[PDB]
Design a protein around this nucleic acid. Structure first.
Ligand SMILES: O=c1ccn([C@@H]2O[C@H](COP(=O)(O)OP(=O)(O)OP(=O)(O)O)[C@@H](O)[C@H]2O)c(=O)[nH]1
Ligand SMILES: [Mg+2]
Ligand SMILES: [Mg+2]
Ligand SMILES: [Mg+2]
Ligand SMILES: [Mg+2]
Ligand SMILES: [Mg+2]
Ligand SMILES: [Mg+2]
Ligand SMILES: [Mg+2]
Ligand SMILES: [Mg+2]
Ligand SMILES: [Mg+2]
Ligand SMILES: [Mg+2]
Ligand SMILES: [Mg+2]
Lengths: 266, 315, 142, 49, 141
RNA sequence: UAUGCAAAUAUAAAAUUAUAGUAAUUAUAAAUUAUAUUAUAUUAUAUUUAUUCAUAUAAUUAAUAGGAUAAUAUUUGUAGUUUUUGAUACCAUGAUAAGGAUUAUAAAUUGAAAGUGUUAAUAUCAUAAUCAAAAUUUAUUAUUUAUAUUAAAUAUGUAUGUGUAGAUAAAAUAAGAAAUUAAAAAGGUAUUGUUGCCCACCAAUUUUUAUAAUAAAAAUAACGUGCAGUAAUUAAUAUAUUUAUAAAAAUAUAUUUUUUUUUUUU
């Protein structure tokens, strides 16, 4: 007498809060009190639901190549899959691996706000790709499988309000959220300014500004992903002094003010 | 007519009907609207402010004479928004060496405040001696009249808060009305750190004193960070202080209260890792927090859940 | 549609014999894809330049468990013959297989080596009426 | 007569002149505009209590 | 709008029948293609009838005079080299320039399918006598 | 085709049927039902050009969350599974098409309401939806016909046969066509009316009796044959004689409860 879609489900948040919390009545949606969302799905069920819902390229469909079934039936005729190792013999294998799915931050405005070339859209906001936890995008680890479930899936359960949410986004959404989720003032009162991976760049900018190449230094300034230290701006404006260029000095300082946390107020 | 409602802006048959303006009438503006002028709403972002200092500002007033002279020693200390990584032992050794050479009370004390701050950031425990070695004699000992520079007080207090310490209770008490009266001049950050440390070491009575003081001095309650208030109210197991904390819990705002419940529920929850020292289980307090929250927020009507068991009587 | 040959037979109307703008018909069915040309052999239904690279489908793009049929636009390569591996294409009823390798295939698409409309007609998929009509056309014997 | 157009405008444009209505109504009369609970077959569904 | 009637099942052993039919259809298509390429190149190399129409001028004129003179002594080697295919014939006549502007305007050439007949063709029936088993697009002898 | 026999509508009567006990009535006439060659109320159909007509596929529709030049919220990172069932492949009302037949020329339109897949109250079998490169059977479609002929998304290999069967298509509008015709007279056993009603035989039964192949008469709702009747597919009605699966049919007379066609000495 009981027909369900899934056999079992799980809770969003754990014992410490729940065991006490249950004593306070929560107001459920009046028309549809019982909520079963995609955050309530189990491991298997979620895996399956994230496979389906992407037309061809998506892992769920059988000929996408990510199919783990060893046999598939086309109209009463059973077909046995060809293993990839054998598929390689007549069809050369070119795989760059993960890194070819990610463009640098530079291109992001050209790409309309994305670093990610994957099948699903990837939002840099917390709430669209949110499962139980807030979504975070690994720029190293991106796979076709998408373990973290951060991508925007077209057909999955509960996708609708998310898709709407995406189409409702502000003009700078992608860019702004990428910028604020990373790059924030330290709990100490210390600037984010010092980061290992970007340091040689800042060294190059300063060293270039000191020999008086302003344009070169700026062309490298463009490539900077993180807030540059005060020394950078000191070097750039000090380079700006001899040739009398005022406008460029002012725009430098104006770039450091209120945009970048006032690194340039010094 | 359908399951899709006519959107009344686009549809002429709405627009041009007798209950709205037809196109042959003269198309002017009907009535003016001043909304933003009559009642104005103050700005509170749902996101916290981006550029705020977020720490304790130690107020460096030094004369621009010694501030040149002491530069080689000072450079190792914190300036504005800059936190040099120099080992604490070295800085304390420098002050211990040179400071008696300089004659000013103000300069030496400002210097010392900076030393305390620098040590509070690295959490070195051997700083407190500098309080007992120089300052204790003229400020906290045996009713000495001298009144300490505010920078110094704030700095030492922040040190006691960062490095968990009992000594704070003697300083705090000196700063009330009858004493130095530095209490109204504290940053919101100061109160946050204070409540956090105090809640960690687990003094219900320290907490009650401090909240009393904050309420009286008109600190900014809702802008006191949630983490610290939750930790502080977590440590409270005593019946009287518990009563005080209900009655005090009403002193917050609607939003603040909801995110107190949320912060609390995250902190013994998934976000248990967010803390350096894990919390201690307080069930009654956490519960009463979620209860206060459920009370102050607006009520939604869920008739099926309320009246689920109801039955009519012909009595 | 009259008979539902697929899912879409429920959704779609034929709308008589109806004209579409040039070279846009909703459902691409290339009946002409295999259409013998000796002189035009390299220019017909193939790459507009000989200097172009092979399509996406001549290469393994990612880590694959494996596939059932390779897409029909994948060009036949000398290795397709030599390696002696399964080469499958999705045609109707089920799948077409390159079984009997030849060098005359090389450098054309299997879009071109697979006859879309076969002269072999099963009578088991036909209604009695349909069989009658095909008899009218002088296709089926009777 | 019947309605050609309808617009929401403040009531101080047309409201019964000060000498027609009873004296200060804000102070001496407690008035709530409310809806009839019963089904009304004709007339207005909002009455002034 | 009638509810579409469902399509009957596929059939049995039909998958093998179809695999087989297409397979050997291709193995046949190989000899089709080979034969047709032979026929095409063979056509390309072999001689053809004269592409011009002798019913108009500058061609009707006696083969001892006018254009033909220009053809015999100056152009002959070139015309015989390209086997009188109408495209290079017309192009050579363009490049000889001693006719110059007239090649397209005044002069007149046999229609495509007639100009394609083998040298020594007598009767028009020769258009429909060419092999029909070969795919050259009327480009075979 | 009036030498045998042979009274018989031209009205003396008291509700229909029925041999004078059967059923509860019957009969009836003018409402209503689109085409029968009328004068030009003021102008024309008898010209032109056409006809080889095909195309659909690889399943998850359920919610809100704001960031630089803003007087300070980590609200950085906002975490309470699980009691409902229709638009589905499936029964599940509505609503807009196509379709030339008599309001005309002046300051002027040659496209109509009578409903053609997708739309709003009947629920109780199922995920069937394009994001490429794909499988002809469907009444409802104007294709290039002999000087020169495949380069950018991939783009149609088949049918030369005396402009040739039957049968079909379009047009009187910035084009060019010119004289043959059409308006007025009509019936209903039905009663939103011909997809209407009825007629006999052919079984059971019910009931009265004046028992003739097989009694008669009256109620009656099966089955099977037809198609008798409503000017009704050779008009009907009455008598007469004949004929016979069944209504009925043939002939002889009278007759309209049938519709009309009309020379005041040519
Ligand atoms: O409200 C917040 C949010 C985040 N954090 C972040 O959590 C880390 C550890 O969280 P804790 O808040 O437990 O460490 P702490 O009190 O010793 O840190 P201080 O305030 O003394 O610096 C902190 O060092 C900071 O990175 C907070 O301290 N408070
Ligand atoms: Mg779908
Ligand atoms: Mg309809
Ligand atoms: Mg009897
Ligand atoms: Mg009887
Ligand atoms: Mg009769
Ligand atoms: Mg009859
Ligand atoms: Mg009759
Ligand atoms: Mg009769
Ligand atoms: Mg008779
Ligand atoms: Mg009879
Ligand atoms: Mg009779």
């Amino acid at each position: 007498s009981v027909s369900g879609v899934f056999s079992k489900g799980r809770g969003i948040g754990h014992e410490a809060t729940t065991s006490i919390l249950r004593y306070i009545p929560r107001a459920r949606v009046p028309w549809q009190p019982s909520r079963f969302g995609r955050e309530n799905l189990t491991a298997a069920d979620m895996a399956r639901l994230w496979s389906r819902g992407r037309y061809r390229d998506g892992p769920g469909n059988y000929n996408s190549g990510y199919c783990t079934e060893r046999t598939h039936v086309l109209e009463e005729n059973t077909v046995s899959i060809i293993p990839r190792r054998e598929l390689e013999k007549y069809m050369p294998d070119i795989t760059i691996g993960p890194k070819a799915l990610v463009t640098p931050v530079s291109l992001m405005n050209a790409r309309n706000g994305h670093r990610v070339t994957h099948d699903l859209l990837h939002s840099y906001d917390p709430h669209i790709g949110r499962l139980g936890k807030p979504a975070v995008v690994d720029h190293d680890n991106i796979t076709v499988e998408d373990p973290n479930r951060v991508g925007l899936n077209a057909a999955t359960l509960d996708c609708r309000g998310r898709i709407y949410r995406w189409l409702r986004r502000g003009p700078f959404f992608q860019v702004d959220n990428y910028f604020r989720r990373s790059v924030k003032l330290n709990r100490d009162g210390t600037l984010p300014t010092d980061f290992v991976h970007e340091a040689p760049l800042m060294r190059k900018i300063i060293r270039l500004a000191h020999r008086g190449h302003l344009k070169a230094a700026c062309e490298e300034y463009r490539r900077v992903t993180t807030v540059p230290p005060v020394e950078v701006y000191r070097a750039l404006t000090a380079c700006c002094v001899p040739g009398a260029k005022l406008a460029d000095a002012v725009s430098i300082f104006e770039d450091g003010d209120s945009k970048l946390f006032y690194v340039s107020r010094d | 007519v359908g399951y899709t409602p006519v959107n009344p802006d686009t549809s002429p048959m709405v627009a041009y009907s007798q209950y709205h303006w037809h196109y042959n009438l003269p198309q002017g503006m009907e009535r003016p609207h001043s909304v933003n002028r009559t009642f104005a709403a103050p700005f509170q972002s749902n996101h916290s402010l981006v550029n705020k200092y977020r720490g304790v500002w130690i107020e460096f007033d030094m004369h621009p004479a010694f501030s040149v002279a002491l530069e080689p020693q000072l450079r190792k200390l914190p300036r504005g928004r800059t936190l040099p990584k120099t080992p604490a032992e070295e800085v304390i050794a420098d002050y211990t060496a040179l400071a008696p050479l300089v004659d000013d009370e103000k300069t030496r004390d400002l210097w010392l405040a900076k030393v305390f701050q620098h040590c509070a950031f690295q959490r070195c425990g051997g700083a407190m001696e500098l309080w007992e070695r120089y300052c204790h004699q003229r400020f906290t000992a045996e009713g000495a009249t001298a009144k300490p520079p505010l920078s110094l007080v704030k700095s030492v207090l922040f040190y006691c808060n960062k490095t968990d310490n009992s000594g704070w209770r003697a300083l705090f008490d000196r700063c009330l009305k009858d004493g130095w009266n530095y209490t109204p001049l504290f940053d919101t950050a100061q109160w946050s750190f204070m409540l956090k440390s105090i809640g960690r070491m687990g003094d219900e009575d320290g907490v009650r004193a401090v909240l009393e003081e904050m309420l009286d001095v008109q600190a900014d309650l809702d802008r006191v960070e949630a983490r610290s208030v939750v930790i502080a109210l977590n440590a409270v197991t005593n019946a009287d202080v518990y009563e005080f904390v209900k009655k005090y819990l009403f002193n917050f705002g609607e939003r603040k209260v909801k995110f107190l419940r949320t912060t609390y529920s995250d902190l013994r929850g998934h976000g248990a890792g967010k803390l350096r020292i894990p919390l201690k289980e307080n069930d009654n307090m956490y519960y009463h927090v979620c209860w206060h929250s459920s009370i102050r927020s607006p009520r939604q009507f869920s008739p099926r859940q309320l009246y689920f068991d109801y039955t009519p009587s012909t009595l | 549609l009259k008979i539902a040959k697929s899912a879409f037979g429920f959704y779609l109307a034929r709308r008589g014999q109806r004209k579409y703008p040039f070279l846009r018909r909703p459902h691409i069915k290339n009946t002409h894809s295999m259409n013998p040309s000796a002189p035009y052999f390299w220019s017909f239904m193939t790459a507009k330049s000989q200097m172009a690279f092979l399509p996406e489908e001549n290469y393994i793009t990612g880590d694959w468990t494996g596939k059932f049929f390779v897409s029909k636009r994948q060009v036949y390569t000398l290795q397709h013959a030599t390696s002696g591996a399964k080469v499958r294409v999705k045609s109707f009823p089920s799948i077409f297989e390159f079984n009997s390798p030849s060098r005359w295939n090389i450098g054309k698409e299997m879009n071109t080596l697979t006859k879309p409309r076969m002269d072999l007609i099963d009578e088991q998929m036909l209604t009695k009426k349909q069989r009658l009509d095909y008899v009218r056309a002088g296709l089926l014997p009777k | 007569q019947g309605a050609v157009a309808t617009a929401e405008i403040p009531a101080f444009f047309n409201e019964r002149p000060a000498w027609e209505r009873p004296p200060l109504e804000e102070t001496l009369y407690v008035t709530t505009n409310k809806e009839r609970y019963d089904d009304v077959r004709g007339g207005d569904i909002y009455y002034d209590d | 709008w009638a509810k579409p009637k469902k399509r009957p099942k596929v059939g049995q052993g039909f998958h093998e029948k179809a695999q087989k039919w297409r397979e050997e259809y291709l193995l046949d298509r190989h000899r089709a293609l080979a034969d047709s390429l032979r026929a095409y190149v063979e056509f390309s190399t072999s001689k053809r009838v004269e592409p011009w129409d002798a019913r108009f001028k500058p061609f009707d004129r006696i083969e001892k005079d006018g254009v033909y003179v220009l053809m015999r002594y100056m152009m002959e080697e070139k015309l015989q080299l390209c086997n009188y295919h109408h495209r290079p014939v017309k192009r050579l006549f363009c490049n000889i320039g001693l006719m110059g502007p007239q090649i397209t305007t005044k002069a007149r050439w046999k229609p495509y399918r007639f100009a394609t007949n083998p040298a020594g063709t007598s009767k028009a029936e020769r258009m429909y006598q060419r092999d029909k088993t070969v795919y050259t697009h009327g480009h075979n002898d």
